[PDB]
Amino acid sequence: ASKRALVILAKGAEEMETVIPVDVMRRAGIKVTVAGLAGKDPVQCSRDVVICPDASLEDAKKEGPYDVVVLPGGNLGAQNLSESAAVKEILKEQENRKGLIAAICAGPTALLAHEIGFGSKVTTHPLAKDKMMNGGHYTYSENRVEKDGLILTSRGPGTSFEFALAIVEALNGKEVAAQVKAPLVLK
C-alpha cells in the first residue's frame, strides 16, 4: 500500500517549495495530492508560476487521512494557510492521529497559528524565526531540516530537496530515500 501525501497549495505559495517536494515524493512512489486551498482553480504562486491543483482541499479532505500533510512556504501562502479553518481542522486531525506534519520556510508559522505541535523543536526561514517564536511555544533550531515529535520542518528553497528526502525517509525508509536521491545530482 503506497503512502499518501497531502500538499496544501495557497495563493502566494513558494512554487519551488511546492514542486520540489511533490516531484521528489512522487519519485519515491508516494501518492501525492496537490490540493488547492481556495478550490479547484489554478493557483498563482509567489513568483507568478501558475500551478493547477489535482483537487480542491474540500475534496481532498474527504479522501484522507494522509501519511503526511505538507505545508509549503512563501509568506503570503503561509498567511493564507494560517487563516484557514479548513487547514486548522486538517492539521488537528493529523496531530491527533499521530501523523507526520511537514512544513518549510514560512510554512511552519501556520503551525503556530493553528496551535499545532507546541513544545517541538522547529526550524524556519531565518526571516520567519521571530514570528514562529512569538510566545516561546517551540524551541528554535538552525538545522537545515529539523524533526521532533510529529513535526518536520525546514528552512527555505535551498533546503527543499533535503526536506523532501526527509519526508521520503520518514514514510518509505532510508534506502528508498537514497535511491531517489542518487539520480537528482545533489551536491
Question: Is residue 178 a contact residue for a second copy (CB under 8 A)?
Answer: no
Within 63-159, residue ranges assigned H as helices are: 75-82, 85-96, 109-113, 129-132
Please state, in angstroms and as integers, the Cα–Cα distance from residue 51 to each residue in 7, 77, 94, 169, following that order: 12, 13, 25, 26
Task: List the single partner that 187 binds among Cl ion, a second copy, none, CB under 5 to 8 Å by kind.
Answer: a second copy
122 to 161: interface string for a second copy, x by CB under 8 A: ---xxx----------------x----------xxxxx-x
| Closer of 60 and 110 to Cl ion (Cβ) | 110
Q: Are 156 and 73 in contact (CB under 8 A)?
A: yes
Q: Which one from 45, 114, 125, 137 is the annotated catalytic residue? A: 125
Active site residue 114: no
- How does DSSP classify residue 101? E
Q: Is 19 in the site for a second copy (CB under 8 A)?
A: yes
Judged by CB under 5 A, which of 75, 120, 124, 154 binds Cl ion? 75
Query: Minimum distance between the CB of residue 79 and a second copy, rounded to whole angstroms?
Result: 18
> How many CA within 13 A on the CB side of residue 28?
30
Residues forming the active site? 105, 125
